């Protein structure tokens, strides 16, 4: 064999060089750093009004406005400081699994299992929220949708592909391929120039927005991936999976840095998020509790117990003044 | 201490809460039925007969039914079935015409899920105009050596039906509702209505403790 042999010997020698040049693990370097202690977070406020499971939730850029996607087909924009419902957008499809909040704050988006996170415009001269564009072209169910700008959105679906769109035209500028299983999560970099995507094929991979090529791929996993997020400097990311483990990779060293698992944990992870300073890692499990993981020590520094069902979506403010956690019990909770 | 504006914000929030409650109350009066089955198993024929993801809405005897067909998803990774909790039931379809073994495997998969323990399942064998003509070519032994019953329509059909029923690994919670009457007549609609009615009554009773 020549193509099989070439592929095998390549993969082998790249991985061997990566292992050899590896110096130490993240925990090995931060041993002299002390734990953060018990991160006791009380529910300062609770958002009520959803009448079904919560699948997704995204913070605004001003750190005061929320948006949450729910199984009942309602996208609600909250005012966190007062628990006011600023907007109530009736979605066309009741099967929603992800969304985002435009950085400018002008736009919010989605659809659902119809393979679209359709876009809504907030600041309209009619005073209501209207559907601006519907980005069609994906074939599999839709796993994420994140804004690069007010006129550029990147999307991840179950077709093993991610697409970069031009909202005004509505045509997918570029389409990304390489996955073999359903793509479940993507995270946009701070500079909106790169992003990482995770898929059911047990492999996360970094995809560039401009060239359209696959800059990198990540492996070292057992089961499918459900959640992914960048370290706040955009120089790393963490993953979450049904294996009941969360993994932190570095897109430069190409090697998995740390593992986030404990024996008592037997169920998967549905969402992941980071602290403003990237010192606390937040993951929403199926065990009805959300664990606060010290990203450098991997110990459980706290638990956001108080959810009566699966914790599906997390979030953090841009200023880090709070944490929003969603679950299937239809209640969002802002913690601090 | 509220300003003249924050009070109007609170009034907006209260109005939105009123709208949310009045729409959720409507959303809780609708029967949700997940539809499953293999290719050419009457799924399309059933959705036509019955009064990305595809939704079909119909009203029968004052009930609002939502039947969700998820046959478009070409990935076999069960990453959205858990979103179908709370559905009143399921409608799994199979055709007498080794397709039968694949259908049995899928039926076992749907019954054995942790997500559908409390949800009845409605197995359908609706068509009865082509289910007898082909029985005479060979008995139920092309891939099923065990069967040694009479090579007649009723006997073989009942044997297949009982073999499907036996797949239920826990009969305590759920129940399988079966149908064999011809698809031509408008009985397939009535059967699902009786099944959902029974499931609704049992859900109500199990809430009090009577069950």
């Amino acid at each position, epitope marked *: 064999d020549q193509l099989r042999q070439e592929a095998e010997q390549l993969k082998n020698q790249i991985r061997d060089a990566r292992k050899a040049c590896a110096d130490a693990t993240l925990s090995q370097i931060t041993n002299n750093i002390d734990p953060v202690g018990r991160i006791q977070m009380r529910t300062r406020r609770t958002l009520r009004g959803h009448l079904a499971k919560i699948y997704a939730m995204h913070w605004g850029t001003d750190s*005061r*406005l929320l948006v949450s996607a729910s199984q009942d087909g309602k996208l609600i924009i909250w005012d966190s400081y007062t628990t006011n419902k600023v907007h109530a957008i009736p979605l066309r499809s009741s099967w929603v699994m992800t969304c985002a909040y435009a950085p400018s704050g002008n736009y919010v988006a989605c659809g659902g299992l119809d393979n679209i996170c359709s876009i809504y415009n907030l600041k309209t*001269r009619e*005073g209501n929220v209207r559907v601006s564009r519907e980005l069609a072209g994906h074939t599999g169910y839709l796993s994420c949708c994140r804004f690069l700008d007010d006129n550029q959105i990147v999307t991840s679906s179950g077709d093993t592909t991610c697409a970069l769109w031009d909202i005004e035209t509505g045509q997918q500028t570029t389409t990304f391929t390489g996955h073999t299983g359903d793509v479940m999560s993507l995270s946009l970099a701070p500079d909106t120039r790169l992003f990482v995507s995770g898929a059911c094929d047990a492999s996360a991979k970094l995809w560039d927005v401009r060239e359209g090529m696959c800059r990198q791929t990540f492996t070292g996993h057992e089961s499918d991936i459900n959640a992914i997020c960048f370290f706040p400097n955009g120089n790393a990311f963490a993953t979450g999976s049904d294996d009941a483990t969360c993994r932190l990779f570095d897109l430069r060293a190409d090697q998995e840095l740390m593992t986030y698992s404990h024996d008592n944990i037997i169920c998967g992870i549905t969402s992941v998020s980071f602290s403003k300073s990237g010192r606390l890692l937040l993951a929403g499990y199926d065990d009805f509790n959300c664990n606060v993981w010290d990203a450098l020590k991997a110990d459980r520094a706290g638990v956001l117990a108080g959810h009566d069902n699966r914790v599906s979506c997390l979030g953090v403010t841009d200023d880090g003044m709070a944490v929003a956690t969603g679950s299937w019990d239809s209640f969002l909770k802002i913690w601090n | *201490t509220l*300003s003249a*504006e924050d009070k*109007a914000a609170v*009034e*907006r929030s209260k109005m939105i809460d009123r709208n949310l409650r009045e729409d959720g109350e409507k959303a809780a009066r609708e029967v949700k039925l997940l539809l499953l089955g293999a290719g050419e198993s009457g799924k399309s024929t059933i959705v036509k007969q019955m009064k990305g993801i595809v939704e079909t809405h119909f009203t029968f005897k004052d009930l609002h039914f939502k039947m969700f067909d998820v046959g478009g998803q070409r990935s076999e990774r069960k990453k959205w079935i858990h979103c179908f909790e709370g559905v009143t039931a399921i409608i799994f379809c199979v055709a007498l015409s080794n397709r039968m073994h694949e259908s049995m495997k899928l039926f076992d998969s749907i019954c054995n899920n942790k997500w559908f323990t409390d949800t009845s399942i409605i197995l359908f064998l609706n068509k009865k105009d082509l289910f007898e003509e082909k029985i005479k070519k060979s008995p139920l032994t092309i891939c099923y050596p065990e069967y040694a019953g009479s090579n007649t329509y009723e006997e073989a059909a009942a044997y297949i039906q009982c073999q499907f029923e036996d797949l239920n690994k826990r009969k305590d919670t759920k129940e399988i509702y079966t149908h064999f009457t011809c698809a031509t007549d408008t009985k397939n609609v009535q059967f699902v209505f009786d099944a959902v009615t029974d499931v609704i009554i049992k859900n109500n009773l199990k809430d009090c403790g009577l069950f």
Partner: single-chain antibody
Amino acid sequence: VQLVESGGGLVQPGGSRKLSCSASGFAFSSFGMHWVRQAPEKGLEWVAYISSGSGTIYYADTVKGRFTISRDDPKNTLFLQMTSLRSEDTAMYYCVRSIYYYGSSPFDFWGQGTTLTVSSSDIVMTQATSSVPVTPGESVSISCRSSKSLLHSNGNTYLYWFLQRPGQSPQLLIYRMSNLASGVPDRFSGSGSGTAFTLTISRLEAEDVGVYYCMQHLEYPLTFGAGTKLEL
């Protein structure tokens, strides 16, 4: 967005009429309505208010209990029924829309007004002057003072800036402080602190001539200023 009123004219003292305001071009049901009036070449004066859904109704101390504000969401129309008119009730009545939610501009749009003629505690804001000659390109600064401090505990200084051009109804420029509205050139700006407030304009143009009004929304009833003019 089009707010058009009607129902004005002439009326003797002690008579009754009904003003009407027809709104079209936006979600009227989600918008609360204000009523404002302006006496002949004297200035503005707030009148009434009805919140979204008819949940709250206020009135001006001048006409509280005499007058009424009515809503009809299905027909997208607004009413102001007037019971008994004194000789002071001559003025040009405006129809103003308002929606309150975090970040909103609650006085974005004004109507074209209507005229009514009759035969012959509260926060007080005073405007420094009523006329100021200036030429284009030479910066100006309009200002007015207030009795109380409009800075609420929310951190919001509920002071607005409307500019009434000759022969045209007022127009929002600033809705809390420096928060430029929709369709307004970026040259305008607003600033102040507690009681002293100023509106600044750089590189003035031919369309900046008119009367400037500063309105307060911290507590009801709302109160306008005398009105500062720019001479050209």
